[PDB]
Amino acid sequence: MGSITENTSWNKEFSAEAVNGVFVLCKSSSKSCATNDLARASKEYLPASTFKIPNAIIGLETGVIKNEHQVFKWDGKPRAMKQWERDLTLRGAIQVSAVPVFQQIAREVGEVRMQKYLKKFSYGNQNISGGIDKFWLEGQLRISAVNQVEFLESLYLNKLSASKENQLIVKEALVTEAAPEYLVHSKTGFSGVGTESNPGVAWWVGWVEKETEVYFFAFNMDIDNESKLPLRKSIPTKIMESEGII
Amino acid sequence: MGSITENTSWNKEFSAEAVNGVFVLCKSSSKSCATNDLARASKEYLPASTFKIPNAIIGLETGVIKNEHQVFKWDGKPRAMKQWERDLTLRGAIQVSAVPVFQQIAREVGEVRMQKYLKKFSYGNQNISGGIDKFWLEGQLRISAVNQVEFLESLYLNKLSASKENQLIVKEALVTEAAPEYLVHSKTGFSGVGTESNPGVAWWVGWVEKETEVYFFAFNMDIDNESKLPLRKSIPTKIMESEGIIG
Ligand SMILES: *[B@@]1([O])OC2=C(C([O])=O)[C]=[C][C]=C2[C][C]1[N]C(=O)[C]1[C][C][C][C][C]1
Ligand SMILES: *[B@@]1([O])OC2=C(C([O])=O)[C]=[C][C]=C2[C][C]1[N]C(=O)[C]1[C][C][C][C][C]1
Ligand SMILES: [Cl-]
Ligand code: NA
């Protein structure tokens, strides 16, 4: 990751909504990043569903996910969101953030291989304590916005310690907007509303390919009410629009 | 490819517009396809810019295209479309159908390796006569809608005779619509307007992933006027909407 400079002017998009959070934006060609809050940019938080990115790669690497067209069948038993109550492709399970699919992937990966790949990926504090099926949701794993950008830059370049094939598979699964000269890869996360004095976290991470430029981004915010969740996309979108990226 | 059945009811979407053409639609789970015109479905036409799909794969396989993120720089000399007068990524050059980028790729691949890979890919009549940089636009290469579907089905499954990595690279470059439970990969082609009695050809080929289903499609039509070109998407889109796919 390049140098990073604090630009406190981006705080305008945050104060307008009374949000405590951070945005990190890096422009690949210039090896330079900017953030509204240097200290928070390095602060580590639960990854929540952003962990679907490494978990998918690891599932493929270990053979738990058999290939890019594996279907994850629904057993017909209640799941916490109706959007999850159906058979899913890998891309579908990522896009609708289907926790139970990824919990079973994690169980089958198992703790040894999971620890091994988080080391290889330099993924946050690499702490998988708290149960193999939940450490990224309610356990001790933490990652910063800076580290998310670093991880995504490696993924973009196919430089993670995993096959290029499996990195490409997960990349296509992360596409969220496609136009002739504009392509977005992204992933949301949301840990919940937290507890008294201890808010939850909401994330949006990804990158934008516009013409021949690439912009890597990571956003997180404190959240204690689900009604604020749209801000996790609207604040970074407004910043990126102000930068002319869109 | 699975079975194929002629459905003449789809002809309503063509006759309403006075278009001579064919649509082939295959549903993966049922290994079954339908078409408005079985004979035309097997008839071979110039691929035009649909050839960017194999050409891109071959460019990567031979190392002419260095990797996924190679930039094709514009030398500043006039090109046939303003949309091509800029540096392009591989996806960009595919999506805007930048002919001069792919002519240079083809020249560097060369006739021998090009011929080898079109045999490996079972790509139409495999006839690359007419100049290494022009055979798919004005030469003797021809491919049918059925063969386009077969080729795309192989690409979807990473079963072409090329690395899995290079097949995946070209697949992401073909994405044209992305939603949480709906994803489209597609490529247009247009050979020109030809003449009266020797019309050009226009194509739309690709596939749709909707929930856990996959629908492969190929459309072509005769075209003698550039103003008709939008039909190359609107006819297949209306058929796929009528099928409940939407597209
Ligand atoms: B995950 O963090 O992603 C997610 C999102 C999102 O990312 O914005 C929104 C709704 C559900 C999910 C699934 C994952 N989050 C959770 O498991 C979380 C849901 C709310 C209760 C606490 C657990
Ligand atoms: B190619 O066939 O793709 C294309 C399309 C399309 O895909 O439908 C539309 C406009 C331009 C192009 C570039 C390629 N076609 C040509 O180069 C062709 C355009 C008309 C005159 C003869 C050359
Ligand atoms: Cl659940
Ligand atoms: Na089929």
Residue numbers in the entry:
A (entry chain A): 19 to 264
B (entry chain B): 19 to 265
Can I see the authors' text?
The β-lactamase-catalysed hydrolysis of β-lactam antibiotics (BLAs) is of central importance in antibiotic resistance. β-Lactam-based inhibitors (for example clavulanic acid) of the Class A serine-β-lactamases (SBLs) are widely used in combination with penicillins. We demonstrate through biochemical, biophysical and cellular evidence that cyclic boronates are potent inhibitors of both SBLs and MBLs.
We then investigated the binding mode of the cyclic boronates to SBLs, by determining a high-resolution crystal structure of the Class D β-lactamase OXA-10 in complex with 1 (1.5 Å resolution). OXA-10 requires a carbamylated active site lysine (KCX70) for catalysis, which was observed in the OXA-10:1 complex structure. Inspection of maps reveals continuous electron density connecting the inhibitor boron atom with the terminal hydroxyl group of the nucleophilic serine (Ser67) and provides clear evidence for a tetrahedral boron atom, contrasting with the planar geometry of the carbonyl carbon atoms of β-lactam acyl-enzyme complexes. In particular, the carboxylate of 1 and the C-3 carboxylate of penicillin are both positioned to interact with Arg250, while the acetamido group of 1 and the benzylpenicillin C6 amide group are analogously positioned to hydrogen bond with the main chain carbonyl of Phe208. Finally, the endocyclic boronate ester oxygen of 1 and the β-lactam-derived nitrogen (from the penicillin thiazolidine ring) are both positioned to hydrogen bond with Ser115.
